[PDB]
Amino acid sequence: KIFCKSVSKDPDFRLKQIDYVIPVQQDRSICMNNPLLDISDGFFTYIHYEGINSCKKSDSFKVLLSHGEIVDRGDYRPSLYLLSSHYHPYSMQVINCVPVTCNQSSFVFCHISNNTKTLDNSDYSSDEYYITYFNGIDRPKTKKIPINNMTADNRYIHFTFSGGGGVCLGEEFIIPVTTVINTDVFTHDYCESFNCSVQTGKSLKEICSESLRSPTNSSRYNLNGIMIISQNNMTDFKIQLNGITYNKLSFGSPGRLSKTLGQVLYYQSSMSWDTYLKAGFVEKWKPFTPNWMNNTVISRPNQGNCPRYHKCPEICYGGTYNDIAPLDLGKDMYVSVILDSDQLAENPEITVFNSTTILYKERVSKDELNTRSTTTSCFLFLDEPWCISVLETNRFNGKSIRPEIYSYKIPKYCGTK
Ligand SMILES: *[C@@H]1O[C@H](CO)[C@@H](O)[C@H](O)[C@H]1NC(C)=O
Ligand SMILES: *[C@@H]1O[C@H](CO)[C@@H](O)[C@H](O)[C@H]1NC(C)=O
Ligand SMILES: *[C@@H]1O[C@H](CO)[C@@H](O)[C@H](O)[C@H]1NC(C)=O
Ligand SMILES: *[C@@H]1O[C@H](CO)[C@@H](O)[C@H](O)[C@H]1NC(C)=O
Ligand SMILES: *[C@@H]1O[C@H](CO)[C@@H](O)[C@H](O)[C@H]1NC(C)=O
Ligand SMILES: *[C@@H]1O[C@H](CO)[C@@H](O)[C@H](O)[C@H]1NC(C)=O
Ligand SMILES: *[C@@H]1O[C@H](CO)[C@@H](O)[C@H](O)[C@H]1NC(C)=O
């Protein structure tokens, strides 16, 4: 509980890159993209997609699933021990996957479909959803989720598991999900309170309603939510689909649930007009109400009319996924690898921040580095706070594309270099 908690320069994160976990592909044309990582109770689950001359998720043919353990090697730092590594049996039909580390095994929740455009012109009854689970010894097993016996809190027509990680609470799995609904049932009191220039075309009430529409169908709305899956031994499933609170709604986007410090932290990537950090601890579960933070310093780059630090409501789409991880509940401290650029996805920086001020930061690379998304997970190691982050990098514009894993420690004292 003793580490740097003040505004300072020159932090010593003791940063180290991990290279033996992520495989190295012999083919230079293959792009390894969209990594996911969830750590819990000393075990982790790593996932990434492989495609040919394209780094798009559904534009793939392989989906890697890795299980491992956190181990002390006497190195005075945590090490990743890879135990099992498998490819998803339905990879060529995977639309999205979310990892969950429960107890001492890996769990992968994937959405499989024949139609890459299923979210724009189809419904969830036309698709299938599976749980693939394994550990260091057991062979991987894939079970189909019975969405037929599912109960929903609203008239949803489609959904996909979308996010950087899930959570295990007792016998229930809670996975972040993005839902689709074809009628405007939503309110926007928070956005309507903004004091911005009125666009000559539409009103502020119209801007915020329409900003929840899909940019590829416009008759559909993308609303974030969670799915609660309880089971005994992959038997007698009870599945519930709850939407996120209508307080401070933002267009559907990949989220995250993480167990940290006795609370449950929810993160939602800001892919619409509110370019500041959407995150918060869970107050109620039905409806899924995270106590949204009022962060005024953490944002993300994007092209178009909503770049970094953009505040005003606007029909915008785009952004980057950047997980956060809490360090101290009383001091309201979090850590995150964010992108230090207004419009381009580049220059990742490890950032320890308040809701109101940035405490300290450090660039990951001295050279300019392209990075499309980051995820961060922190844990106690040797009675000290350590974190592991994965960055979706493209440093070799001439060699193959591959994500990178970094491990670092929160500085014990401020300003040591
Ligand atoms: C794709 O179509 C085939 C034939 O209709 C079907 O067997 C399969 O289950 C479909 N896949 C999904 C995810 O629905
Ligand atoms: C757009 O969504 C509506 C609502 O279900 C659907 O009927 C229509 O086919 C979709 N159009 C496209 C091009 O996906
Ligand atoms: C994980 O272990 C706990 C016991 O501490 C148990 O209650 C829970 O059902 C287990 N979860 C799974 C998915 O096996
Ligand atoms: C806009 O101004 C009003 C006061 O007229 C204020 O109450 C409100 O909080 C402001 N909007 C935002 C988003 O802060
Ligand atoms: C759970 O089911 C599997 C079969 O899929 C079986 O091998 C295993 O022993 C079962 N575990 C328990 C605790 O019943
Ligand atoms: C953010 O501000 C709102 C309005 O004052 C408040 O209700 C909410 O609790 C604040 N967030 C946190 C994390 O306290
Ligand atoms: C960070 O926020 C806390 C309130 O949670 C405040 O007391 C503190 O002054 C802030 N940090 C700095 C450097 O001012």
Author numbering: 209 to 625
Reproduce the article's own wording on this structure.
Cedar virus (CedV) is a Henipavirus species isolated from the excreta of Pteropus bat colonies in Queensland, Australia. HNV-G proteins comprise a short N-terminal cytosolic region, single-pass transmembrane domain, oligomerization-mediating and fusion-activating stalk region, and C-terminal receptor-binding β-propeller domain. Binding of the HNV-G to cell surface receptors belonging to the ephrin ligand family initiates pH-independent activation of F, triggering a fusion cascade that results in the ultimate merger of viral and cellular membranes. In our integrated structural and functional analysis, we demonstrate that in addition to using the common HNV receptor, ephrin-B2, CedV uses ephrin-B1, a receptor with no precedent of HNV usage.
To assess the extent to which this sequence divergence is reflected at a structural level, we determined the crystal structure of the CedV-G receptor-binding domain to 2.78-Å resolution. Electron density permitted modelling of the entire receptor-binding domain of CedV-G included in the crystallized construct (residues K209–C622). Like the prototypic HNVs, the β2 and β3 blades are decorated with extended loops that form three short 310 helical segments (η1–η3) and three α-helices (α1–α3). Eight disulphide bonds stabilize the fold, seven of which are conserved amongst other HNV-G proteins, indicative of structural importance in stabilizing the β-propeller. The receptor-binding domain of CedV-G possesses eight N-linked glycosylation sequons, three more than the prototypic HNV-Gs. Electron density corresponding to an asparagine-linked N-acetylglucosamine moiety was observed at seven sites. Concomitant with genetic proximity, structure-based phylogenetic classification places CedV-G in a cluster of ephrin-tropic HNV-G proteins, closer to the Asiatic prototype viruses HeV-G and NiV-G than the African GhV-G.
